[PDB]
Amino acid sequence: SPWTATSGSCKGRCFELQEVGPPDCRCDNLCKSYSSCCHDFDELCLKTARGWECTKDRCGEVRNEENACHCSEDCLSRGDCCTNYQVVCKGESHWVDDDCEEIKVPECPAGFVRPPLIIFSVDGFRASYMKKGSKVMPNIEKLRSCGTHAPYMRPVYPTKTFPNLYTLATGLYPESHGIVGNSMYDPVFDASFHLRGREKFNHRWWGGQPLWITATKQGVRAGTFFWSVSIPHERRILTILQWLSLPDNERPSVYAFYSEQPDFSGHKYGPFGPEMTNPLREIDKTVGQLMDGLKQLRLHRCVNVIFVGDHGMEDVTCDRTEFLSNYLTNVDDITLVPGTLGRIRAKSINNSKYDPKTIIAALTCKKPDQHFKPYMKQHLPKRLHYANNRRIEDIHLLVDRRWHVARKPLDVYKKCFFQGDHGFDNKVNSMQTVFVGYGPTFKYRTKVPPFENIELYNVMCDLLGLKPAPNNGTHGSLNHLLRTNTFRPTMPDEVSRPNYPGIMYLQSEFDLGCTCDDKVENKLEELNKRLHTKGSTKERHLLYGRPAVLYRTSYDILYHTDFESGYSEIFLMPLWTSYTISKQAEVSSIPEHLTNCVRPDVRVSPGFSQNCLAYKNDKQMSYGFLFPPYLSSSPEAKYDAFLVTNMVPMYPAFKRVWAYFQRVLVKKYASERNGVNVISGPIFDYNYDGLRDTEDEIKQYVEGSSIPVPTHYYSIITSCLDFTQPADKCDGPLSVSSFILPHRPDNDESCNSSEDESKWVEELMKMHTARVRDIEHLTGLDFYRKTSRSYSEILTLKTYLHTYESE
Ligand SMILES: *[C@@H]1O[C@H](CO)[C@@H](O[C@@H]2O[C@H](CO)[C@@H](O[C@@H]3O[C@H](CO[C@H]4O[C@H](CO)[C@@H](O)[C@H](O[C@H]5O[C@H](CO)[C@@H](O)[C@H](O)[C@@H]5O[C@H]5O[C@H](CO)[C@@H](O)[C@H](O)[C@@H]5O)[C@@H]4O)[C@@H](O)[C@H](O[C@H]4O[C@H](CO)[C@@H](O)[C@H](O)[C@@H]4O[C@H]4O[C@H](CO)[C@@H](O)[C@H](O)[C@@H]4O)[C@@H]3O)[C@H](O)[C@H]2NC(C)=O)[C@H](O)[C@H]1NC(C)=O
Ligand SMILES: N#Cc1cc(Cl)cc2c1C[C@@H](Nc1ncc(C(=O)N3CCC34COC4)cn1)C2
Ligand SMILES: [Ca+2]
Ligand SMILES: [Ca+2]
Ligand SMILES: [K+]
Ligand code: NA
Ligand SMILES: [Zn+2]
């Protein structure tokens, strides 16, 4: 390691805020972790004498600087009283014993320019501990009941510690901030990141801009967020309280506490082992020390406190391990990053025999109850946002909750007794964690719906008056947590205006190789057809306004009896198709005579249309329709569903999924939700960056054509939250579920796909559930432009994820 001159001194420097560089010895809260503290750091900065609590006998003692904390009359002015000083010595109450009283305005001491923010972060604090441990956590239960709380907060994938803490700090997905696991190899650096050792302290791992840097760059001082493991929790609290006693111009406005518990014990004992009660009690006692200490400093109605976890904890035992050696012939030629997720790469880049395709195949649906599923990273559910980083191996194993994956059996017993772990898919209930906000800027006695931890950075910025660095939150989506300091964004400006084409082409101008048995012949209904094509039913089918197109392109709005679309002249297909299905709608067949019907659209030039010949010649690719012919309002309207402008390229394997969605599931949802509005369309994300591809990024076309092949198909399914009102006459808040289905040429993902669609398609769709915001990123469209609802409410709706977990 680098040389440090430990012969310097921490006198007058204990828990200094500014870092000093090698070779200078350190006195900060992380110095122990770098083995670089000055020789007298323990003696001066980690005093322990007489413990952490005042007692009657110590009240008004002569100050003894040796003591861990003080009970002398000068201690409040020095800022170093034991947290219970005023209770024991001055007849005050513990904070927890005081009634909840609304904090309508900050009540801060003179010299405080803004309410400080204290983040109280807890590792492995599973969401359900707030109910199941409530009898042993009175301080936490008071924060929860009196402040603003969610029933749970969704972590990021993988549900590991450093990825989640750093997402809290940055607002970024792991793929963007770079901490993609607790273990990583970076092929460009040729460097490895591990929990143990020095490499993880190198700045090149840590991307984005974390909150303490955002603060500092904008003139807001920060406490150092990382605490060496051996610093007792009592000392971390005392350190924060001492910093809060610094002069105004020296004093931070943002702070973080961290606890390794309950994660540490949860690994040993399982999430609900009897041994878990004590760690929860201890954390609660720490919270009480903080709050008593704030009360002493007259800050308990001034500071905003966030109580937040990184991830939950699941029951996992050594016996529930899958071994790759039971699947692969070649297990010595791979490197596996193991555990609650798998990542596989070649052991040697000089091995020309390594082949990811044969590895995937050998891992796919090989054992009936197989407890992991292999994916190429681009095929992972888009909601995980887990692909666009060179540190993420191409081959990924999604491991079932309660299981591990390992390379060989000896890997498990050459080192177990553990009973808990985490890392699984971030929709899994056991992985959910906690959020409580308490203070003047948060709401009083308020429950908010579950939300994702990527959203918190923005809020913490709002709490501190900071402009957030660019991040993956949706700023304004959490305004409903806040009494004040809301962020009031404007809707993005539409970049491309639509064309509204009329009838401009004769049938014979088209030479598309299409056919349709549609030659059948009325002045009464002549006018009706013309009205429908000029948009007379658009209010029924486009319920929340046209989506706005946020990039430069050429597209047409096309109206029909049963659906409206925004048709791209560049991609030769809709960007979006919008239609409403009432609870009373009937499903019908595709008539025998229309099975292979495709019809030219006389509003759209031959040159801006798909053609049927390309599909005939492309022996791998077929086609489907975005507005489903099955849900036509009448036999005559059904002809509109067969327009070439409603056609999209679909692999036969995918058509099985799509047809079941369209013929069975849409009507099921309309029945259950009292009507639904559906917006469906293609997505192109060939570079797996979560963002709309430009034309030049497209890697596959329908053979012999310029018709690009989507990587995914989306649908956004909206109805009235009050399901006593039909989707098309909803006066209040909305309810949404969405999906982003991978457009794959096989159903290998679905191990039961040989069975009828009723046994597997809906399961696939649930796995590929999505937020509206995910679709916005992937399409460059902006939805819900014209509703009766507040914009912040709509932002919340766009971040909603339908998870399909139990309670
Ligand atoms: C979630 O939120 C985040 C944040 O808003 C979104 O990420 C942004 O998306 C942008 C598009 O993908 C991306 O913009 C690019 O930035 C390039 C330079 O970036 C550097 O500087 C910024 C600013 O300080 C910094 O944040 C970057 O940090 C990344 O890289 C470092 C390593 O150096 C990492 O430590 C860090 O974690 C982060 O890595 C992540 O992003 C990079 C991409 O930058 C990925 O590769 C990583 O895997 C990881 O995900 C950088 O230090 C900039 O140079 C780009 O400009 C090109 O594009 C335009 C397009 O027209 C073109 O005109 C330009 O000429 C240029 O092209 C030329 O270079 C091409 C690339 O080599 C070349 O092929 C061409 O031929 C051209 O010569 C571009 O603007 C932005 O960096 C990230 N920011 C972050 C923090 O990740 C993210 O999209 C959101 N996610 C979702 C789903 O919404
Ligand atoms: N990023 C981030 C972030 C974001 C928020 Cl909102 C709060 C906090 C954080 C960070 C956290 N402090 C914290 N985390 C981990 C550790 C830890 O593990 N350490 C220190 C040495 C070892 C490495 O192995 C043992 C210590 N301290 C408090
Ligand atoms: Ca953790
Ligand atoms: Ca893309
Ligand atoms: K074909
Ligand atoms: Na299958
Ligand atoms: Zn852990």
Measured N-to-C along each axis, helices 772-779 and 791-799 cross at an angle, to the nearest 10 degrees, of 90
The total of other beta-carbon atoms located within 10 Å of residue 444's CB is 15
Q: In this structure, are strands 769-770 and 734-742 parallel, antiparallel, or unpaired?
A: antiparallel
Determine the Cα–Cα distance for residues 161 and 193; give it in Å rounded to an integer.
14
Which residues does the chain break after (C to N > 2.5 Å)?
415, 521
Q: What is the DSSP letter of 26?
A: B
Structure token digits, residue 412: 């498990």
The total of other beta-carbon atoms located within 10 Å of residue 56's CB is 8
Please say whether the dihedral angle defined by the alpha carbons of residues 47, 49, 53 and 57, taken in this order, is positive or negative: negative
Ligand 2 atom 4: the closest Cα is on which residue?
Answer: 169
The total of other beta-carbon atoms located within 10 Å of residue 366's CB is 12
Domain interval for residue 794: 507-799
The total of other beta-carbon atoms located within 10 Å of residue 102's CB is 12
Element containing residue 765 per DSSP (H, E): helix 761-767
Tracing tokens 């190789």 back to the chain, one arrives at 513
Bridge partners of residue 682, in order along the sequence: 713
Determine the Cα–Cα distance for residues 22 and 508; give it in Å rounded to an integer.
80
Let me know: does 429 contact 806? Beta carbons within 8 Å: yes
SS3 of the chain: helix, strand, coil, percent, to 5: 30, 20, 50
Q: How many helices (H) and strands (E) does the chain have?
A: 23, 29
Q: In this structure, are strands 304-309 and 117-123 parallel, antiparallel, or unpaired?
A: parallel
The total of other beta-carbon atoms located within 10 Å of residue 491's CB is 12
Let me know: does 226 contact 169? Beta carbons within 8 Å: no
Atom of ligand 2 nearest to the CA of 195: 24
Ligand 2 binding residues, C-beta < 6 A: 33, 119, 121, 165-166, 168-169, 195, 210, 225-229, 256, 258
Count Cβ neighbours within 10 Å for each residue of 155-165 and write b for 16 or more, e otherwise: bbbbbbbbbbb
Q: What's CA 229's distance to the chain center, in Å? A: 28
Q: Which of 148, 489, 113 is nearest to 306 (CA)?
A: 148
Single-letter amino acid code for the residue at 463: L
Structure token digits, residue 687: 């570079």
Q: What are the backbone dihedrals phi and psi of residue 406, each rounded to the nearest 5 degrees, phi first?
A: -145, 165
Tracing tokens 């709002």 back to the chain, one arrives at 462
Count Cβ neighbours within 10 Å for each residue of 214-238 and write b for 16 or more, e otherwise: bbeeeebbbbbbebeeebebbbbbb
Let me know: does 294 contact 107? Beta carbons within 8 Å: no
Ligand 1 atom 47: the closest Cα is on which residue?
Answer: 389
Measured N-to-C along each axis, helices 161-170 and 456-464 cross at an angle, to the nearest 10 degrees, of 40
Determine the Cα–Cα distance for residues 791 and 799; give it in Å rounded to an integer.
13
Q: Write down the H helix ranges in 270-332.
A: 277-296
Q: What are the backbone dihedrals phi and psi of residue 594, each rounded to the nearest 5 degrees, phi first?
A: -115, 5
Q: Which of the residues are catalytic?
A: 161
Let me know: does 529 contact 627? Beta carbons within 8 Å: no
CA of 58 to the centre of ligand 6 (A): 73
Q: What's CA 622's distance to the chain center, in Å? A: 34
Q: Does 388 sit in the ligand 1 pocket, CB within 6 Å?
A: yes
Strand-by-strand arrangement of the 304-309 sheet? 254-262, 117-123, 304-309, 435-438, 148-149, 446-447
Known binding-site positions: 123, 161, 182, 263, 267, 310-311, 422, 685, 687, 689, 691, 693
Torsional class of 111: left (φ above 0), alpha (ψ -120 to 50), beta (otherwise): left
Bridge partners of residue 344, in order along the sequence: 336, 395
Bridge partners of residue 566, in order along the sequence: 557, 576
DSSP state letters, 213-237: HHHHHTT--B------TTS-HHHHH
CA of 658 to the centre of ligand 4 (A): 23
> Can you give the CATH number for the domain in which 531 is found?
3.40.570.10
Single-letter amino acid code for the residue at 658: W
Atom of ligand 1 nearest to the CA of 777: 94
Determine the Cα–Cα distance for residues 116 and 98; give it in Å rounded to an integer.
22
Beta strands in 582-702 (DSSP E): 622-625, 647-650, 676-683
Q: Reduce the DSSP state of residue 438 to 3 states and report it.
A: strand
Determine the Cα–Cα distance for residues 634 and 588; give it in Å rounded to an integer.
9
Q: State yes or no: cis peptide before 23, omega within 30 of 0.
A: yes
DSSP state letters, 61-115: PPP-TTBSSB-STTHHHHT-B-TTHHHHHH-PPPGGGSPP----S----TT-SS-
Determine the Cα–Cα distance for residues 377 and 398; give it in Å rounded to an integer.
10
| SS3 labels along 710-759 | CCEEEEEEEEECCCCCCHHHCCCCEEEEEEEEECCCCCCCCCCCCCCHHH
Q: Does 689 sit in the ligand 1 pocket, CB within 6 Å?
A: yes
Determine the Cα–Cα distance for residues 500 and 5; give it in Å rounded to an integer.
75
